[PDB]
């Protein structure tokens, strides 16, 4: 289906073989087979292919080697809070001619820029990545929409899949069907939440490799999706800067209108009901222990905050008050008594420079996008860890 005037999706899905016929209905019957999805080989192939696609897509684009210079920076917002992350900066670019240096200005985010070494609280600034590695901006034709991908085995091999609805990732499946190609899974890049994923069929599934070891990561597969809105409201403008012979740089030029906070919106009642049912499914795995929903442990901004992208811009959302409250008893929230329209709103921040996959991949400077960004999504699953404290004899924390 993904064949149009545009072929430069970052996952390069146009080059794949088109699946002409219907998907196979090849149920076997009288077949039992043991499965271990924590030992599956295909996930490592998927991770390697995503890394290789990222490298081969970011390879021919424009580099940012000459831009890493001394930056003289000052305040950009007239405020003193909320949206104070904007800063203004000036520098010296190189024109087409080598001997002609030109004074230039650009706007930046506060997480992108770093005050220079041995500063006397001065205006001297630099980029974050300049003492780590190089960086390349993304080409503006590149579209980051998660087009679905069907993995297929070669001829002479086969793909067996489980059909048992309560299959929690281990154990033998009574209902096993073969198929030529996998279904339309999506390469959605996110952390701490699953977006646009395949829904659980009838029951909220908890998958963990050991369930008592806290080093294992609990995968929570929700039965019903939770719809989430995310937006950056303020009107951004894109400017262009000539750097070197025949290649251009893009940056944030100006903001039009009153600046408002980038945020996300979640229906609070459905989220609490989902957390309540997850607490039911977890307390039936951990009897006589009240669980607690608490914020994640402290660490990096990319690790603590829920990170994703919609459009070409990248979002990092606070989510501390999202994971709040304790579930005890049996269905204590009672859903609701009235027609509540309560929406929990998460504040979010935006980075331009990302060292995605923890530096295994490559640096990218995401170019800014004019206008505004709005994006809608379904939360279908959660990534949780068991904070197994000593005083958790009855009050467990996740």
């Amino acid at each position, epitope marked *: 289906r993904a064949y149009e005037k545009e072929v430069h999706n970052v996952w390069a899905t146009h080059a794949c073989v088109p699946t002409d016929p219907s998907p196979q209905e090849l149920v076997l019957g009288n077949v039992t087979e043991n499965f271990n999805m924590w030992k599956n080989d295909m996930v490592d192939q998927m991770h390697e292919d995503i890394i290789s696609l990222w490298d081969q897509s970011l390879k021919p684009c424009v580099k940012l080697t000459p831009l890493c210079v001394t930056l003289i920076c000052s305040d950009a917002t007239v405020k*003193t809070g909320t949206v104070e992350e904007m800063k203004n900066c000036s520098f010296n670019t190189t024109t087409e001619i080598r001997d002609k240096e030109k004074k230039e200005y650009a706007l930046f985010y506060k997480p992108d820029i770093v005050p220079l070494s041995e500063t006397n609280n001065t205006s001297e600034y630099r980029l974050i990545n300049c003492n780590t590695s190089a960086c390349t901006q993304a080409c503006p034709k590149v579209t980051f929409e998660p087009i679905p991908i069907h993995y297929c085995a070669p001829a002479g091999y086969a793909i067996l899949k489980c059909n048992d609805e309560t299959f929690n990732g281990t154990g033998p499946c009574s209902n096993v069907s073969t198929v030529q190609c996998t279904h339309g899974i999506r390469p959605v890049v996110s952390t701490q939440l699953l977006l646009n994923g395949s829904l659980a069929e009838k029951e909220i599934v908890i998958r963990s490799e050991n369930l008592t070891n806290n080093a294992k990561i609990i995968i929570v597969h929700l039965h019903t999706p939770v719809e989430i809105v995310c937006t950056r409201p303020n*009107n951004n403008t894109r400017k262009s800067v000539r750097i070197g012979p025949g290649q251009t740089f893009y940056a944030t030029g100006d903001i039009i209108g009153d600046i*408002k906070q980038a*945020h996300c919106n979640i229906s609070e009642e459905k989220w609490n009901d989902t957390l309540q049912k997850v607490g039911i499914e977890l307390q039936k795995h951990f009897p006589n222990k009240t669980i607690k929903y608490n914020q994640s442990a402290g660490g990096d901004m990319e690790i603590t905050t829920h990170s994703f992208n919609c459009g070409g811009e990248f979002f990092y959302c606070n989510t501390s008050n999202l994971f709040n409250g304790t579930y005890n008893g049996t269905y204590i929230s009672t859903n609701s008594s009235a027609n509540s329209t309560s929406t929990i709103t998460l504040q979010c921040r935006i980075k331009q420079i990302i060292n995605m996959w923890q530096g295994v991949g490559r640096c990218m400077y995401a170019p800014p996008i004019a206008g505004n960004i709005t994006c809608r999504s379904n939360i279908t699953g959660l990534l949780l860890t068991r904070d197994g404290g000593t005083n958790s004899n009855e009050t467990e924390t996740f």
Partner: antibody
Framework: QVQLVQSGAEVKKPGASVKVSCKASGYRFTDHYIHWVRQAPGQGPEWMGWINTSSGRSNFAQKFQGRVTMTRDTSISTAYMELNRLKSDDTAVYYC????????????????????WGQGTLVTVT | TQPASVSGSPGQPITISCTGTSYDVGNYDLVSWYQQHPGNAPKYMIYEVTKRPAGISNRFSGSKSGNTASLTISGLQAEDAADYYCCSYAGSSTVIFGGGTKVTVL
């Protein structure tokens, strides 16, 4: 009841500068944007710009760039207009208007909901 | 961008039109109407494309068709002889006015 006390009549020569006060009353002044409207005699309205009372962020018409500045403070609930280097056409009736409610999550500063009006003032250029 | 004058007997309805571009009228419903008696401050008449403020009678109503909008005055009296203005968000945090219409109540 909400009401905006504008300042008195200004009579001065061309090339001078005019500051006009607008004292708000009846509401918490941080809640709403402030716009200002000019009106030449025998002529309709004329928009200059707006000011965010929460943070002092302001915007202008393109022909009023540089000549105008806006300030405010919610400590005494007032906002000060300042027009510099007046011309002969700048003789007008000036109106303080309460804009829409100030939100945190959407740009409502451009909303043309001028709910309440000041009494007006006269700026005359001799 | 507004017709200069309109006339009408008391009791009959009329309409006042305003026509702009796609940028100011076509894109957004953020269009307002105001009235102004001579020797008086402009008065708050219509805020949304159709919504009336509290305290405003059923004399007036808002409407929009494509690139233009109109204030329909349902019935008339002499007190509606004031000037009328339309106003709109014009994009890029800019606010413009249509220009005016003198209502001449017969």
């Amino acid at each position: 009841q909400v009401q905006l006390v504008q300042s008195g009549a200004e009579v001065k020569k061309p090339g001078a500068s005019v500051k006009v006060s607008c004292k708000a009353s009846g509401y918490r002044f941080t809640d709403h944007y402030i716009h200002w409207v000019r009106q030449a005699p025998g002529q309709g309205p004329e928009w200059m710009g707006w000011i965010n009372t929460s943070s002092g962020r302001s915007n202008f018409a393109q022909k009023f760039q540089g000549r105008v500045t806006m300030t405010r403070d919610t400590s005494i609930s007032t906002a000060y207009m300042e027009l510099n280097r007046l011309k002969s056409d700048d003789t007008a009736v000036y109106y303080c208007t309460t804009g829409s409610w100030i939100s945190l999550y959407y740009d409502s500063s451009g909303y043309p909901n001028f709910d309440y009006w000041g009494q007006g003032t006269l700026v005359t250029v001799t | 961008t507004q017709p200069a004058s309109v006339s009408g007997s008391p009791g009959q309805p009329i309409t006042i039109s305003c026509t702009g571009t796609s940028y100011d009228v076509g894109n957004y419903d953020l269009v307002s109407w105001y009235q102004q008696h001579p020797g008086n401050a402009p008065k708050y008449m219509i805020y949304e494309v159709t919504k009336r403020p509290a305290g405003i009678s059923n004399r007036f109503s808002g409407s929009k068709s494509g690139n233009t909008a109109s204030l329909t005055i349902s019935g008339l009296q002499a007190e509606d002889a004031a000037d009328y203005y339309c106003c709109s968000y014009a994009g890029s945090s800019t606010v413009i006015f249509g220009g005016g219409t003198k209502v001449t109540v017969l």
